[PDB]
Give the backbone structure.
Amino acid sequence: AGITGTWYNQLGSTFIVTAGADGALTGTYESAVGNAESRYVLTGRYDSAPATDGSGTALGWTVAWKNNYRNAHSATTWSGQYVGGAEARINTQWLLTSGTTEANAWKSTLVGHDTFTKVK
């Protein structure tokens, strides 16, 4: 599967990911320091038997931005695919939804993209 390990996005954010044989993604967001106050849980799913036609491996995961120290009242989902080979990558599009009032629901969800590599 090649997914398990530490991944870094284009801005250097760090994600520790374990790909279970059953399709589970588990792990954490860590800060550059790895301090407890900036650690958040991630959970998701991936295709544990991808196509053998050189297609990437579809996946997704979520981080809710609460831990025992901080709560931003928001959550991000990343949707994408893992691409193996010499320079393995996870190419994703993300949505960041913040909890809002109904009046402010229109501005609840930011969109962007993250590309993850096994090197900083």
Summary: Residues 66 and 72 are 6 Å apart (CA to CA).
